[PDB]
Design a protein around this ligand. Structure first.
Ligand SMILES: *[C@@H]1O[C@H](CO)[C@@H](O[C@@H]2O[C@H](CO)[C@@H](O)[C@H](O)[C@H]2NC(C)=O)[C@H](O)[C@H]1NC(C)=O
Ligand SMILES: *[C@@H]1O[C@H](CO)[C@@H](O[C@@H]2O[C@H](CO)[C@@H](O)[C@H](O)[C@H]2NC(C)=O)[C@H](O)[C@H]1NC(C)=O
Lengths: 49, 23, 17
């Protein structure tokens, strides 16, 4: 906004985005599906939920 | 002379547990 | 149309000695 050899001035526009939480969850586990093998009419088959 | 190798018994303990629904 | 197998993830049930 101003530029002398002994003086300066600047302006900065900052925009912020604050997420407001509804609930916070701390003690958490990841799921790992393993399933089960089934041997049916000769064929081996992997079964999963 | 006659060298031989006689088998002698031993064992290793192996525990196993289940995984309900496979999860 | 026959009834098929049942699975219940019980290890103790499938032990072979
Ligand atoms: C692992 O478990 C086995 C169970 O088979 C232990 O075997 C026993 O060892 C002792 C010697 O300390 C023998 O007197 C017993 O007869 C064995 N028990 C059996 C065959 O039922 C073995 O000692 C264990 N190994 C370790 C490293 O702890
Ligand atoms: C898992 O399998 C075992 C073995 O079939 C079941 O344990 C038996 O339960 C019966 C009663 O329902 C007892 O009479 C037997 O003595 C048990 N056997 C042994 C080796 O413990 C067990 O109930 C099954 N189900 C679950 C959920 O564990």
């Amino acid at each position: 906004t101003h530029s002398s050899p002994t003086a300066t001035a600047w302006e900065i526009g900052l925009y912020y985005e604050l997420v407001i939480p509804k609930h916070i969850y701390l003690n958490n586990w990841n799921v790992v599906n393993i399933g089960h093998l089934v041997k049916s009419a000769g064929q081996l088959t992997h079964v999963t939920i | 002379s006659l060298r031989m190798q006689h088998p002698v018994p031993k064992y290793v303990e192996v525990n196993m547990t289940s995984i309900p629904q496979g999860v | 149309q026959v009834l098929g197998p049942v699975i219940d993830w019980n290890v103790t049930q499938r032990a072979v000695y």
